[PDB]
Assembly symmetry: D2
Homo-oligomer: 250 residues x 4
């Protein structure tokens, strides 16, 4: 089991990429707490993967600062000390910078930027200096590397996550905290939410977008996250792991 003994929090773990991360983490021997905003969805998601000896759902909005210390406490009471934090919760807004309202701006940043900050900051405090082989995996995207004219606030959030993560990685390395911090950058990934938007997959699959001529699937992101959570990646910190069908290569 590649994640033997690991205890992971996966935010936004009830859907899509986060759900697949949680699934493969359990498959590789980790104990997992998945979070999400909606109880019915989250309860169903946890049970689809396993029983409560390996996976539990906690209702939590990643933008909710006070709930973060309670999420660590709940996870530790269930499974023992947290070793792995996957800051995956996020939302998107389909607006250019020009057309973004301040309400849209602040709401998106509250989840995509503050949530990652809260999970990274608290993960460092709670995991440092414990010999855990701890790993913080911050979900950026291709929109952390390149602009999209229709994703202005999303681009801001993903660029922030990209570079903030390097700061955290360096501090943890320099202080011998035994915590690594890295970013994962999905390209387009097929999910029910993509399926719900008529024409989206076909636009994303055009060769001028994704050179492979199709989009990915959630397990494509789960497998790079297994590598980064595992001790196999003990010399990887401060780096960016791109799984995008070639999007950023052209």
């Amino acid at each position: 089991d590649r994640l033997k003994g690991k205890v992971a929090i996966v935010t936004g773990g009830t859907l899509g990429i986060g759900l697949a991360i949680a699934d493969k983490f359990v498959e590789e021997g980790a104990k997992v707490v998945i979070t999400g905003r909606h109880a019915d969805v989250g309860e169903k998601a946890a049970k689809s993967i396993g029983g409560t000896d390996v996976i539990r759902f906690v209702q939590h909005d990643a933008s909710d600062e006070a709930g973060w210390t309670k999420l660590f406490d709940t996870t530790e009471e269930a499974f023992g000390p947290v070793t792995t934090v996957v800051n995956n919760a996020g939302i998107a807004v389909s607006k250019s910078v020009e057309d973004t309202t301040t309400e849209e701006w602040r709401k998106l940043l509250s989840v995509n930027l503050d949530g990652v900050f809260f999970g990274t900051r608290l993960g460092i405090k709670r995991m440092k200096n414990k010999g855990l082989g701890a790993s913080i995996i911050n979900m950026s995207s291709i929109e952390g590397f390149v602009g999209d004219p229709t994703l202005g606030a999303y681009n801001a959030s993903k660029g922030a996550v990209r570079i903030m993560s390097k700061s955290a990685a360096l501090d943890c390395a320099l202080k011998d905290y035994d915590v690594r911090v890295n970013t994962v950058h999905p390209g387009y990934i097929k999910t029910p939410l993509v399926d719900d938007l008529e024409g989206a997959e076909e636009m994303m699959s055009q060769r001028t977008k994704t050179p492979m001529g199709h989009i990915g699937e959630p397990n494509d992101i789960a497998w790079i996250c297994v590598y980064l959570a595992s001790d196999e990646s003990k010399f990887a910190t401060g780096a960016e792991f791109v799984v995008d069908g070639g999007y950023t290569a052209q």
Copy 2:
């Protein structure tokens, strides 16, 4: 005059890099409004460069959304339509991600990220489709490219500015708005604020930090900004201009 007919807003234009940008912009024929939080400083700064037919100071905090439309109005009443926005206002916090308080986080992002967003969004709206050769110059830094363990929130802000600017550049290009958007990335620059911190310049000048073995001066940033404001750079958009003594090259 390389900036003949240009009308520029330079935020944080009363000190340091912003002051030098304003100085060289006036030297090259632009009319300039500089902003800053402190009236005595700003009044002295404007008069040090020129008379009110070429430069004026407006007291404005870049984090103040409502003041942005009034700043454009004041500038346009003085000098005619704005052509050039330099989003240079910014603050720094000397904290790791781990040690950043939420108050510090939100305050720094309010200036460094929201201020750039407000100036970029409003610059697009106010300058598009007017044949102005309009240019938005967003001040990132080397901390938009690489982490610094002691500058966590600053790194987040500068990474956000870096990638958000690409979104804006693309939208403006695709829609034929006649607005370019680019980022400038200073390395270490000697200013009175650096001089006020005992030992700072020497730390910044170590070869493991700045390969040139010294730090820069404000005019180093002013001259790349002249290029980007001028029609000489009419094919440059969505790009990052690094002036750092080699910092990021190693």
Copy 3:
């Protein structure tokens, strides 16, 4: 077994990083041919990993164009169609650009650049359109991202490998060849050759070089290569995978 059915060529597979790649590839079910310039070393290396039903050594200099088609033939006769090419053979010269002789320049490029070109070009021709889940892993380094004043020709070679690999990745993706191409970028890795150079490991382990305060080991590179050779990484192409202890993050 994560590499079930895979058949790999690992150039420079008799020492260091390449040897560890070959070792872990065999552990995960691949059949492997390792190459190197020296027969005694290579024979010992292959036997240290396994018997000839899983690993063989072929004497080959990666700069030797004519030997490439014979290497594929030998590998295919042993194990069936090649699925995976790891272009790892390389040499280093300790010279600035200024101090590099033309002889040094051409010799280093003959292995580090031509060898990767030959293996990539021939891997595409020999592996395309066969439903193999084929993967070409080109060994760049941190010196593909950042300069080192003492490694001028090496930097040229590693930058070339970095961007050439993106071209190949795109062509293969656009043409539905079922071949992925990615680069791996080691930081400093402890090997007998590092051990042979008094003071080298300590210089490499300074925090201003490697933030983790130590260097890596060959298996750190082997594990990212397992991921990239495996079908787990079927949506990853044209990307750069950095395993460097934080070197490039600052």
Copy 4:
């Protein structure tokens, strides 16, 4: 005059981008030697810009190592010590990595990579430690950042130039040589050679290629080169200057 007292060699200076660089360098007060392979073209090119007190043509192939020291001698005899080297000579091949012949590979690298190496190495030796404010400007391209499936060898060459230049920049900075080294990265630029290829400009101008919806002109590259040759850019070294209509921003 922004280049007062400068003495420049511009390789491939008889056509296109190089010709415009030479033109604007003369306009800004530099003395210039342009090189090219064809005497009739080069003689006409030099005379189109000015008389022999400001510009001369020397027939030289940048791949010709022995001719480099004679080119510096000829330039110095005419105009005094060389201060500025623009390594702009280059050729292109329209082949994927897969389809590149070894002859094509070696020929393209002989100009695009060896020529830049020869000019950079010799520029350092001939310009260091003379208080010249010396500047080496190495012409990369967007193909130094991103792959193009049809430009495999070109991508290799441009990636090599990109990273080799950082090595040289660092060495020069660390040794206080008073030599800066930077790369310029044109996107698509309208030239007679583009005009000669039916359909090329329209393909290059598609929004999925160049977001601005048109290609650039040679003076777009000349103006960034003026900045980099001038003392205005005295703190810029080891950096990449992209003038591409947004190509790399998406």
